[PDB]
PDB file of C-alpha atoms and ligand atoms in Angstrom:
ATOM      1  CA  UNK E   1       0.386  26.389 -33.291  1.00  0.00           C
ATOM      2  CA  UNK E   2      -0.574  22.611 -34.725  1.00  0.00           C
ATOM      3  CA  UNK E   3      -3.923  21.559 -35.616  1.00  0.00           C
ATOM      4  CA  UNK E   4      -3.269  17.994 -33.971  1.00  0.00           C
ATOM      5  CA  UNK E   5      -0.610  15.696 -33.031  1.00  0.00           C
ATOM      6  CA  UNK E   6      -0.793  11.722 -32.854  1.00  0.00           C
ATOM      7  CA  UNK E   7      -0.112  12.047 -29.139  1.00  0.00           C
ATOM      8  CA  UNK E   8      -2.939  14.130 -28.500  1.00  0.00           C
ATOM      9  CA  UNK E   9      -5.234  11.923 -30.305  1.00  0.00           C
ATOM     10  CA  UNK E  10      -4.299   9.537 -27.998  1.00  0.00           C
ATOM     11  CA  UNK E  11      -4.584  11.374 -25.339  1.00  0.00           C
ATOM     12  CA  UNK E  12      -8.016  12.686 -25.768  1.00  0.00           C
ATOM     13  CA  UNK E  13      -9.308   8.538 -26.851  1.00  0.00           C
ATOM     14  CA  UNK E  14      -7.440   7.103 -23.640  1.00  0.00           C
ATOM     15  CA  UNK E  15      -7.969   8.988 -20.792  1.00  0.00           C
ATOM     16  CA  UNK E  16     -11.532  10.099 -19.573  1.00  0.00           C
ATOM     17  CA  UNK E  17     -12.791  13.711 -20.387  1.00  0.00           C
ATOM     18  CA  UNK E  18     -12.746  15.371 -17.040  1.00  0.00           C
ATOM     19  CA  UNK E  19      -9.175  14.141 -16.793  1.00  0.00           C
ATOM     20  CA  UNK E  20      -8.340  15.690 -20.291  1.00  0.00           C
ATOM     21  CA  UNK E  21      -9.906  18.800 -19.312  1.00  0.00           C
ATOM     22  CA  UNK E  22      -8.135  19.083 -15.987  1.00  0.00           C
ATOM     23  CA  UNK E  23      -4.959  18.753 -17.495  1.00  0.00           C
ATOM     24  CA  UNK E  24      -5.656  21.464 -20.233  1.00  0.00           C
ATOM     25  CA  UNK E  25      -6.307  23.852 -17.656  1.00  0.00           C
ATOM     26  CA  UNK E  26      -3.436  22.934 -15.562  1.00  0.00           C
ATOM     27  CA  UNK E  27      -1.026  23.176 -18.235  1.00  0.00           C
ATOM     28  CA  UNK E  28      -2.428  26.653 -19.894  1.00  0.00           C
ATOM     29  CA  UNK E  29      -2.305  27.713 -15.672  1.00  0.00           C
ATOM     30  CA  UNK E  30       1.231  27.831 -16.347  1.00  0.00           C
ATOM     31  CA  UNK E  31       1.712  28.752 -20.087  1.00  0.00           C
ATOM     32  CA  UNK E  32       1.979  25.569 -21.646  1.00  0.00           C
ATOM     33  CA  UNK E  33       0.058  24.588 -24.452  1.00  0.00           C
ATOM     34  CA  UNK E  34      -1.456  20.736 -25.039  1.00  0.00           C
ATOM     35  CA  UNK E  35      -1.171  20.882 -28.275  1.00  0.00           C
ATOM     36  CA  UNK E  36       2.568  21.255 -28.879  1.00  0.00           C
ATOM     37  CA  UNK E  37       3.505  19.842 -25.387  1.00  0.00           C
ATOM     38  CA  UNK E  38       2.038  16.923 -25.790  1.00  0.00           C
ATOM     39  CA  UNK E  39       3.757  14.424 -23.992  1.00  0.00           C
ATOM     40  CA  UNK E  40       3.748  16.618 -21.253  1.00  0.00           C
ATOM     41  CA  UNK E  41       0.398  16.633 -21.681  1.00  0.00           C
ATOM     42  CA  UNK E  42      -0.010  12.822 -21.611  1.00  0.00           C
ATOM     43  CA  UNK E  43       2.244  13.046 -18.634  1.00  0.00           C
ATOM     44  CA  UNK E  44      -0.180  15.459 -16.833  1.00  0.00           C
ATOM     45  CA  UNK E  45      -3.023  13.197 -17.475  1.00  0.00           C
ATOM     46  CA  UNK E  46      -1.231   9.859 -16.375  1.00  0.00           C
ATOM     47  CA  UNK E  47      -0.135  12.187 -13.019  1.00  0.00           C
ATOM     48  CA  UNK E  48      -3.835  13.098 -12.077  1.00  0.00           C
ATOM     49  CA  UNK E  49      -5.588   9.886 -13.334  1.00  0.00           C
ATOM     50  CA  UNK E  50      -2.978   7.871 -10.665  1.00  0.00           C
ATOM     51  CA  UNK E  51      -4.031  10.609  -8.162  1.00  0.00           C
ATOM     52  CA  UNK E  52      -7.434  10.160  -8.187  1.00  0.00           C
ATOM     53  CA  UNK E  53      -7.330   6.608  -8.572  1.00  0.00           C
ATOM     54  CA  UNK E  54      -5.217   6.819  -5.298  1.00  0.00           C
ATOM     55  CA  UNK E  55      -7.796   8.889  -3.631  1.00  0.00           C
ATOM     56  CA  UNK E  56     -10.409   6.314  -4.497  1.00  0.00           C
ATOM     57  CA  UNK E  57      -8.435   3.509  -2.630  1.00  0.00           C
ATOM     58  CA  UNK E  58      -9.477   3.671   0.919  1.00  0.00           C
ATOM     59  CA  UNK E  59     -12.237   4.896   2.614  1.00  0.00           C
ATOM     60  CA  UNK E  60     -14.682   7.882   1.855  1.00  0.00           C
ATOM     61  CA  UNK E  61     -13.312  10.930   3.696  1.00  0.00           C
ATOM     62  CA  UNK E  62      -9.761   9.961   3.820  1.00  0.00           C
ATOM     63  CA  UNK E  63      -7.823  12.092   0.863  1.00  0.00           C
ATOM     64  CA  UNK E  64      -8.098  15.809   0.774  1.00  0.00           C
ATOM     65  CA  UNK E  65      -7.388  15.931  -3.332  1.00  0.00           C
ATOM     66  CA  UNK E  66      -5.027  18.765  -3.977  1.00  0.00           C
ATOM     67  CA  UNK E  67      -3.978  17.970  -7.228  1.00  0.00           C
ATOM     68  CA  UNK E  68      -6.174  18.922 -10.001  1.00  0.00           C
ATOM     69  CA  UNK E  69      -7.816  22.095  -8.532  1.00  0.00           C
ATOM     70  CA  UNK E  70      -5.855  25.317  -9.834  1.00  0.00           C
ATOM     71  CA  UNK E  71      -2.983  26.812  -7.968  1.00  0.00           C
ATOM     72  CA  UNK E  72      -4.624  29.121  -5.266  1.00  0.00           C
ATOM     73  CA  UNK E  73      -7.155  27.438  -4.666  1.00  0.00           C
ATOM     74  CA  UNK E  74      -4.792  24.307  -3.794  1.00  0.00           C
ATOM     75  CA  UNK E  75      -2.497  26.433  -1.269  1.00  0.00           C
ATOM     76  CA  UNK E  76      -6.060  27.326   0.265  1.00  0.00           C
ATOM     77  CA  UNK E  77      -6.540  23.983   0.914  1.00  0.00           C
ATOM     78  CA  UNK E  78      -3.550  23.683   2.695  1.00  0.00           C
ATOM     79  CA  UNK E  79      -3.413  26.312   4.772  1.00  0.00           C
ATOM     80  CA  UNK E  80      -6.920  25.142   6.425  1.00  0.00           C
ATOM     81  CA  UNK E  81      -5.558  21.935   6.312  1.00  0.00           C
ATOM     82  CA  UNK E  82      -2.493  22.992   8.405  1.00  0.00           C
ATOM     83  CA  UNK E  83      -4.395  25.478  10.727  1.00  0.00           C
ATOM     84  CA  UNK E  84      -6.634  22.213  11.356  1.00  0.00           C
ATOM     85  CA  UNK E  85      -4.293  19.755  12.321  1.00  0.00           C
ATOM     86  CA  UNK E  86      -1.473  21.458  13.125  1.00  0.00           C
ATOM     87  CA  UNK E  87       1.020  19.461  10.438  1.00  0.00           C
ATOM     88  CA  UNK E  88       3.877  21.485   8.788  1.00  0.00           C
ATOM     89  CA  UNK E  89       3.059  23.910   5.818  1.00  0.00           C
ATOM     90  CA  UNK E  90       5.532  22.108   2.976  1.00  0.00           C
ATOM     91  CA  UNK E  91       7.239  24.788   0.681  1.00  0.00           C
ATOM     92  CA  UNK E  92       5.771  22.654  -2.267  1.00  0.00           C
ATOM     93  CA  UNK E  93       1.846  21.749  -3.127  1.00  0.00           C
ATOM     94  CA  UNK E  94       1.535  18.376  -2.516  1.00  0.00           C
ATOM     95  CA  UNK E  95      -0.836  15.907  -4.220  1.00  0.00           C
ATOM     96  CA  UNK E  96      -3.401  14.582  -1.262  1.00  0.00           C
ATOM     97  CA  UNK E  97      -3.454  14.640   2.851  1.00  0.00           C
ATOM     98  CA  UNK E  98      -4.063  11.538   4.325  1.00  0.00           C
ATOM     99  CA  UNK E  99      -6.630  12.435   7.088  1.00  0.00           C
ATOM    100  CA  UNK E 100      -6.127   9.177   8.552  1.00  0.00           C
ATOM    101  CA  UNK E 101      -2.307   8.914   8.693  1.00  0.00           C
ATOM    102  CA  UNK E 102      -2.429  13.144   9.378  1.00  0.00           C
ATOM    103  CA  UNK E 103       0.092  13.382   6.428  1.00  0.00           C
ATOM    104  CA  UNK E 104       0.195  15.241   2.660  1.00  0.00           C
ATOM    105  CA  UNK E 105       1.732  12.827  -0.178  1.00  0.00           C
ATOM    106  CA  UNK E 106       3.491  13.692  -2.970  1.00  0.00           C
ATOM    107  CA  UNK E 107       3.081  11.153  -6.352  1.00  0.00           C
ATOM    108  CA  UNK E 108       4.927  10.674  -9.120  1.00  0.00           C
ATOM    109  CA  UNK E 109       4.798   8.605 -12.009  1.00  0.00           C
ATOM    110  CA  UNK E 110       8.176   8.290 -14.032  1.00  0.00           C
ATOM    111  CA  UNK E 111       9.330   6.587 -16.864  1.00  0.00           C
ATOM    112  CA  UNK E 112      13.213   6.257 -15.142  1.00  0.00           C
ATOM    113  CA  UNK E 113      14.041   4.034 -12.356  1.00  0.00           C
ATOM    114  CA  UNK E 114      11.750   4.633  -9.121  1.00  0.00           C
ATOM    115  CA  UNK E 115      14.664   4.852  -7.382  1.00  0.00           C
ATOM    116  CA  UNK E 116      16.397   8.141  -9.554  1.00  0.00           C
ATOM    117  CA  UNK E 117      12.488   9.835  -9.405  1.00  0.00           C
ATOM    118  CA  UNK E 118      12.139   8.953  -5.618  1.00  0.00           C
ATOM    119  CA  UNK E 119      15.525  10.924  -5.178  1.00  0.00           C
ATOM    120  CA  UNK E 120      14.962  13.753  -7.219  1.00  0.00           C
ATOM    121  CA  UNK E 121      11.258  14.585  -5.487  1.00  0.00           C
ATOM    122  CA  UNK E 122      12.670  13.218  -1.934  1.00  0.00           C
ATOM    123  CA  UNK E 123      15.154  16.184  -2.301  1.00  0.00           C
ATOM    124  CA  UNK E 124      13.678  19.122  -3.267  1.00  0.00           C
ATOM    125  CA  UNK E 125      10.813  18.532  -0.641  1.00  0.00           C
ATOM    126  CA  UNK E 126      13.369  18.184   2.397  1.00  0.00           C
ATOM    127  CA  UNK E 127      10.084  18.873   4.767  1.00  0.00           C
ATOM    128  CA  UNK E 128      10.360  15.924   6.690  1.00  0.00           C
ATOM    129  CA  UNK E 129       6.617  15.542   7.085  1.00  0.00           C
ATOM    130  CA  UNK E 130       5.569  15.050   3.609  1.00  0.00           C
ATOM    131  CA  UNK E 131       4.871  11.275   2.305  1.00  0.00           C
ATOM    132  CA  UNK E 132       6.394   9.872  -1.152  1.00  0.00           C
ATOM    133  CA  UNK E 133       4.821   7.477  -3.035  1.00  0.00           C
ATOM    134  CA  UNK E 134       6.382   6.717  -6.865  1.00  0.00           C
ATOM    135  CA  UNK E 135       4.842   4.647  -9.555  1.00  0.00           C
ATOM    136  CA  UNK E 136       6.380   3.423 -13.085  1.00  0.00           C
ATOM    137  CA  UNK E 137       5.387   2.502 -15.691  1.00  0.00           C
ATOM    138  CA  UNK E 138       6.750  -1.211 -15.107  1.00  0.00           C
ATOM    139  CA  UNK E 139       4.829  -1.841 -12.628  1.00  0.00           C
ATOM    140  CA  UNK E 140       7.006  -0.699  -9.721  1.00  0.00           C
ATOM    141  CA  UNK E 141       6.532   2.142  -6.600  1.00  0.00           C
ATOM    142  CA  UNK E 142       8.515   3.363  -4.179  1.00  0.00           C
ATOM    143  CA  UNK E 143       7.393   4.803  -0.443  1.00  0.00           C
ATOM    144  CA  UNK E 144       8.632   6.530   2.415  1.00  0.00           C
ATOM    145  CA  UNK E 145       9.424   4.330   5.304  1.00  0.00           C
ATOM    146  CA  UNK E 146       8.154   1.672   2.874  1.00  0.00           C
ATOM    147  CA  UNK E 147       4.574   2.875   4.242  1.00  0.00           C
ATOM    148  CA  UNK E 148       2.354   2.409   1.165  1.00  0.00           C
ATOM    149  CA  UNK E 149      -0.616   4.344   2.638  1.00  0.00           C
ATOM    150  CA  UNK E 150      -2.751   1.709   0.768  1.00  0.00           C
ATOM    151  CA  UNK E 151      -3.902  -1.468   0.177  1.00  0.00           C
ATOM    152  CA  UNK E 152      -2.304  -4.101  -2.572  1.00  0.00           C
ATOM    153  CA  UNK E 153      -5.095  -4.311  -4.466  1.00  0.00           C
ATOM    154  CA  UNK E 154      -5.643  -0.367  -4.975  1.00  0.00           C
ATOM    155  CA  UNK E 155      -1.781  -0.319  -5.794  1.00  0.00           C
ATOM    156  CA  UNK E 156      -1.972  -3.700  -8.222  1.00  0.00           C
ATOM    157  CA  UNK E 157      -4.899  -1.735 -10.181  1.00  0.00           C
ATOM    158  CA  UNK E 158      -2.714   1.614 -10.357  1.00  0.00           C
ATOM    159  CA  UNK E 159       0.381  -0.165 -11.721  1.00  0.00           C
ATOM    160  CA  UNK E 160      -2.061  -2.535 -13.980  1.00  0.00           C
ATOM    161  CA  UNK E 161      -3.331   1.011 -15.510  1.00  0.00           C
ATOM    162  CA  UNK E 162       0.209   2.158 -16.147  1.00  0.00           C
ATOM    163  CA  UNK E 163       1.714  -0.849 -18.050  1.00  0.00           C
ATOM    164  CA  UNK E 164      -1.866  -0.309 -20.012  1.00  0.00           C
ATOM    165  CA  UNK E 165      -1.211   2.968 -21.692  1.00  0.00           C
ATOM    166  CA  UNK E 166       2.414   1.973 -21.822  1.00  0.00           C
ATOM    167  CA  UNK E 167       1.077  -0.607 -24.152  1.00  0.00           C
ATOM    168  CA  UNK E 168      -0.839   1.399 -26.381  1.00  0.00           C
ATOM    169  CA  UNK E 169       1.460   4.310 -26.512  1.00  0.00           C
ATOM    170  CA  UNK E 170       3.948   1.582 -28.171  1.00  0.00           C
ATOM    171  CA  UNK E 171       1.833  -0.061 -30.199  1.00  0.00           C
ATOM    172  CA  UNK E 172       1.015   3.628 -32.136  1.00  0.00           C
ATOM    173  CA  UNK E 173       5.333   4.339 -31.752  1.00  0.00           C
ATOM    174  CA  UNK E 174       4.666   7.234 -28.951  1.00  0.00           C
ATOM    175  CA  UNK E 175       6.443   5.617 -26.128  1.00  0.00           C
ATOM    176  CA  UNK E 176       9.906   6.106 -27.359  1.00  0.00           C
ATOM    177  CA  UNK E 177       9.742   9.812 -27.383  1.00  0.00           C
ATOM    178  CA  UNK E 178       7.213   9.451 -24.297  1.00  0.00           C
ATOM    179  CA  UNK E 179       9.944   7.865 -22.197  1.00  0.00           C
ATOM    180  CA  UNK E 180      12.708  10.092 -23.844  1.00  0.00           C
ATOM    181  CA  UNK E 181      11.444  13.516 -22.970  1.00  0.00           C
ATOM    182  CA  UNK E 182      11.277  12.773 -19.213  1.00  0.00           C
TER     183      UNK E 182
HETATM  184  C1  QQ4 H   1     -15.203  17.031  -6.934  1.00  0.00           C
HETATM  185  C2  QQ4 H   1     -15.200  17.489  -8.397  1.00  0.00           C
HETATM  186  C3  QQ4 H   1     -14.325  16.595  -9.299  1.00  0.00           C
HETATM  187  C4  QQ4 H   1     -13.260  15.807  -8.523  1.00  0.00           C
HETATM  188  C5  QQ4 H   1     -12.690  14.690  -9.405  1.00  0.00           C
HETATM  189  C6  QQ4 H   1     -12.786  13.258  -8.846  1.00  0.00           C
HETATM  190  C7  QQ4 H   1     -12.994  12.328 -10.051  1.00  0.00           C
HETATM  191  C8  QQ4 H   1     -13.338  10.865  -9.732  1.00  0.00           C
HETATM  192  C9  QQ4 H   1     -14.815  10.625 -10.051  1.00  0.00           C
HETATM  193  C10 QQ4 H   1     -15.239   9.218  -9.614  1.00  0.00           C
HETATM  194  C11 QQ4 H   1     -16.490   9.327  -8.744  1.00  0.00           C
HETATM  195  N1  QQ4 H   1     -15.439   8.283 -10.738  1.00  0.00           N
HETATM  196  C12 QQ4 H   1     -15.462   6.828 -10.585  1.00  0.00           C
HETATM  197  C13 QQ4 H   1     -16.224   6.302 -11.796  1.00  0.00           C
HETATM  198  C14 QQ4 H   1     -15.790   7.230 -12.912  1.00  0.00           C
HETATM  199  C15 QQ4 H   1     -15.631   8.563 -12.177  1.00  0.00           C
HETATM  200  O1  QQ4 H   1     -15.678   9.620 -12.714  1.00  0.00           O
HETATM  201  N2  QQ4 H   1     -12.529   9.967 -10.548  1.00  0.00           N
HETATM  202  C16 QQ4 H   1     -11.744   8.853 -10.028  1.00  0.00           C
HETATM  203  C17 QQ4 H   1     -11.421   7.957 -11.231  1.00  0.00           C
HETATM  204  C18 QQ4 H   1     -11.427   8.896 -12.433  1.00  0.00           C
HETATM  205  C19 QQ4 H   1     -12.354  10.018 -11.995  1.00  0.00           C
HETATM  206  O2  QQ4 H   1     -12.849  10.795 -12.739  1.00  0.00           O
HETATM  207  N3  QQ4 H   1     -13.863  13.119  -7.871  1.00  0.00           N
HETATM  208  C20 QQ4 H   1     -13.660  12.788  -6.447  1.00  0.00           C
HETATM  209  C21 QQ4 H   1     -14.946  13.201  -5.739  1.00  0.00           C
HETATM  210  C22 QQ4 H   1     -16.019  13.021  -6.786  1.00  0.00           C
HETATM  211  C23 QQ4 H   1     -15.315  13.265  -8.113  1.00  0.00           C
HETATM  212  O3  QQ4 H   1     -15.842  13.532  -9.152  1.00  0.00           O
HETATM  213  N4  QQ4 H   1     -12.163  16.692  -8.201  1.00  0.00           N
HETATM  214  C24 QQ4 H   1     -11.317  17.394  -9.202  1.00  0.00           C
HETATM  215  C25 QQ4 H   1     -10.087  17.840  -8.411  1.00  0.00           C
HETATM  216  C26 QQ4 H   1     -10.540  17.994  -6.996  1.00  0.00           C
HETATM  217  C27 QQ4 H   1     -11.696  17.048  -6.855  1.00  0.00           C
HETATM  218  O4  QQ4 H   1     -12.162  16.664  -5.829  1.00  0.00           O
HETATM  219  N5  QQ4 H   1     -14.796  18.887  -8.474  1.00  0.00           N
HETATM  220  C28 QQ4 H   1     -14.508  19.769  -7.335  1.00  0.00           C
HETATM  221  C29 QQ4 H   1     -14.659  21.188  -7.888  1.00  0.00           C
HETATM  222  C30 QQ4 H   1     -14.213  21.077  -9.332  1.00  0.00           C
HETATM  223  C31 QQ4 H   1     -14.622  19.657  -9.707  1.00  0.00           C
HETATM  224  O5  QQ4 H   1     -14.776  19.256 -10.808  1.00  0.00           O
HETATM  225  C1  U3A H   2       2.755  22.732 -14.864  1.00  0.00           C
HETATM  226  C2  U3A H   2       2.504  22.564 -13.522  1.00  0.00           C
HETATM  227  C3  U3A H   2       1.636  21.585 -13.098  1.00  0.00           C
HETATM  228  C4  U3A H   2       1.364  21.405 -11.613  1.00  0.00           C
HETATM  229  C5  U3A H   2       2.707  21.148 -10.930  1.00  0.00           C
HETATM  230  N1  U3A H   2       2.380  20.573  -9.651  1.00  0.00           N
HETATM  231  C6  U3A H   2       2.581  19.203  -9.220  1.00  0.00           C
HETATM  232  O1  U3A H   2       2.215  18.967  -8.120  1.00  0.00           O
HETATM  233  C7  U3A H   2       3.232  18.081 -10.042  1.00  0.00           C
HETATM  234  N2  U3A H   2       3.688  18.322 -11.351  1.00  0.00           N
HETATM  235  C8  U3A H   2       4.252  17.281 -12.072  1.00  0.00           C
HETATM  236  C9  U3A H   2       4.797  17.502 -13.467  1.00  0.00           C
HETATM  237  C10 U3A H   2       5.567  18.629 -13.665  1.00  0.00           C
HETATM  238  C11 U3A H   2       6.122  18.863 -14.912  1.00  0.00           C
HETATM  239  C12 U3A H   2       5.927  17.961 -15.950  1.00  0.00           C
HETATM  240  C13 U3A H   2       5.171  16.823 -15.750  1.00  0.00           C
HETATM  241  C14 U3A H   2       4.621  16.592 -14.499  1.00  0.00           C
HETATM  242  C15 U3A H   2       3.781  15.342 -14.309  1.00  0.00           C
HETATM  243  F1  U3A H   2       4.381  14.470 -13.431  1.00  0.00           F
HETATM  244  F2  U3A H   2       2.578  15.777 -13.829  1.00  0.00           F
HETATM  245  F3  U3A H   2       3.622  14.764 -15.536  1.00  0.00           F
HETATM  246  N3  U3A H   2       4.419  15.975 -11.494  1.00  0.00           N
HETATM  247  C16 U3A H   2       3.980  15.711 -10.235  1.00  0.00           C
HETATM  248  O2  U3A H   2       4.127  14.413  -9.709  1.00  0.00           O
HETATM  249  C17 U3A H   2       3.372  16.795  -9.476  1.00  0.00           C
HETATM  250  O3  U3A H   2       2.931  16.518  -8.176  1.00  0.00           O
HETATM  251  C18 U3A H   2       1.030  20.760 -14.024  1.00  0.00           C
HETATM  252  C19 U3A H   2       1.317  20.962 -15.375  1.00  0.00           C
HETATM  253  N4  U3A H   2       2.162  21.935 -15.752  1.00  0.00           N
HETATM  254 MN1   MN H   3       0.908  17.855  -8.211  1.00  0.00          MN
HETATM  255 MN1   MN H   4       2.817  14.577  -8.099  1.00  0.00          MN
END
């Protein structure tokens, strides 16, 4: 319906253009438009630039990326991932597997307290098997077991990157509404 909001702006001169495009798709995947949703939208591209800047921490064949490819092709993914190594098939698509810890992870990045967002994604996966891994926007994460999967310095960036578009949503009056319409 709109020609272009402030938040998309933003959106489209903050995070990178594969990102942007990734989250277009994933929103109209599920009827949602980016140009009247758009904090949603900024939401979707803070969820998949954390992602993939999680995937890059570690080594080079350790994350299976889920997130980001479109719905099928995702649960395809997991279903060789689970005939392969035998872990349980969660009733939710997760985010990555962690071939080295034999695990799929779910992350979330809220603008509440870790420990409300941890409880609302810790229950409705309720498949034992799946890791949980929350980041804020204040520079703050949450993990099962307290098993962080990755190193400080991979987190440190993730939670630097955060506070950063934090920061510039406020400083053009977005962040208000931002961290109301969670
Ligand atoms: C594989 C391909 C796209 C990948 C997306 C993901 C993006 C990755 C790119 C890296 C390198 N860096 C670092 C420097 C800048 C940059 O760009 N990062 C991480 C930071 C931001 C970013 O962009 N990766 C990881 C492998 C190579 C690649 O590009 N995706 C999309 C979802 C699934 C997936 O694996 N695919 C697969 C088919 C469709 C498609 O597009
Ligand atoms: C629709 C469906 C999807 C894919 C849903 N699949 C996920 O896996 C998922 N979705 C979300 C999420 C859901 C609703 C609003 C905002 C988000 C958030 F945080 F991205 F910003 N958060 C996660 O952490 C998450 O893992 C994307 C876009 N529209
Ligand atoms: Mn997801
Ligand atoms: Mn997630």
């Amino acid at each position: 319906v709109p020609r272009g909001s402030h938040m998309e702006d933003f959106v489209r001169q903050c995070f990178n253009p594969m990102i942007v495009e990734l989250a277009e798709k994933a929103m109209k995947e599920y009827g949602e438009d980016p140009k009247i949703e758009t904090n949603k939208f900024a939401a979707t591209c803070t969820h998949l630039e954390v992602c993939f800047m999680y995937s890059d921490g570690g080594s080079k064949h350790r994350f299976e990326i889920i997130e980001g490819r479109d719905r099928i092709m995702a649960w395809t993914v997991v279903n060789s991932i689970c005939n392969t190594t035998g872990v349980e098939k969660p009733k939710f698509l997760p985010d990555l597997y962690d071939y080295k810890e034999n695990r799929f992870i779910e992350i979330g990045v809220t603008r509440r307290e870790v420990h409300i967002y941890y409880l609302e994604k810790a229950n409705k996966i309720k498949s034992e098997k799946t890791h949980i891994h929350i980041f804020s926007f204040t520079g703050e994460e949450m993990a099962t077991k307290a098993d962080y999967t990755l190193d400080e310095e991979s987190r440190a960036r993730i939670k630097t990157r955060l506070f950063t578009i934090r920061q510039e949503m406020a400083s053009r009056s977005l962040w208000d509404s931002f961290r109301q319409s969670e």
